[PDB]
Amino acid sequence: SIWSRIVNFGSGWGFWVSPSLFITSTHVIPQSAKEFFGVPIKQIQIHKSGEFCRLRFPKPIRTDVTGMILEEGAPEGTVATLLIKRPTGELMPLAARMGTHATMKIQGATVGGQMGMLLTGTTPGDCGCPYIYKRGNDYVVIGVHTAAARGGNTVICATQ
Ligand SMILES: *[C@@H](CC(=O)OCC)[C@H](C[C@@H]1CCNC1=O)NC(=O)[C@@H](CC(=O)[C@@H](NC(=O)c1cc(C)on1)C(C)C)Cc1ccc(F)cc1
């Protein structure tokens, strides 16, 4: 259902928020591609906020999916789900308690997002996978995976 919206993208993953909106991590988008999903790159309207990368296609690409709510992170303390897809195809939902929103230094670079704590991990191929949580009856996507700290269970969710 939601898992079909996570797709192989460059060195990582990306997520269909809607038929026309695809988000991923700046570290993962292929910089030399001439088209994405058959659409020439010039027709694709791309925005970048640090490690958050959103792609707006001129025409619906995934007509089978419904638009999902995209917000800038989650209320502090929200237990979200990092929806990890592995190249083996295995689905690995990882619970993460979301922490402070901040402008953070990560390997010298500035990135905007939200810290989280894996509850009970993540690997270099996992960047771009989405963080999601359920509010009422609505699913809400809050960002994409971009980093995880060594010597700890902290993960970084890049946000808009
Ligand atoms: C995914 C992207 C990737 O592979 O990039 C290579 C071009 C990858 C996922 C993490 C790898 C280990 N586990 C993961 O979940 N992301 C990265 O490698 C980013 C860098 C890191 O994750 C480092 N983490 C940190 O520096 C850090 C600091 C804090 C508070 O938390 N984490 C190491 C653990 C490797 C790539 C990146 C992201 C954003 C940047 F601004 C610079 C670099």
Residue numbers in the entry: 4 to 123, 133 to 172
Original authors' sentences:
The protease plays a crucial role in viral replication by cleaving the polyprotein into individual nonstructural proteins. HuNoV proteases are cysteine proteases structurally similar to picornavirus 3C-like proteases with a chymotrypsin-like fold. Their active site features a catalytic triad with histidine-30 (H30) as the catalytic base, cysteine-139 (C139) as the catalytic nucleophile, and glutamic acid-54 (E54) as an acidic residue which orients and stabilizes the conformation of H30 (15). The substrate binding pockets S1 to S4 in the HuNoV protease, which accommodates the P1 to P4 residues of the substrate, are in the cavity between the BII-CII loop (beta strands BII and CII, residue 102–117) and the DII, EII, and FII beta strands of the second beta-barrel.
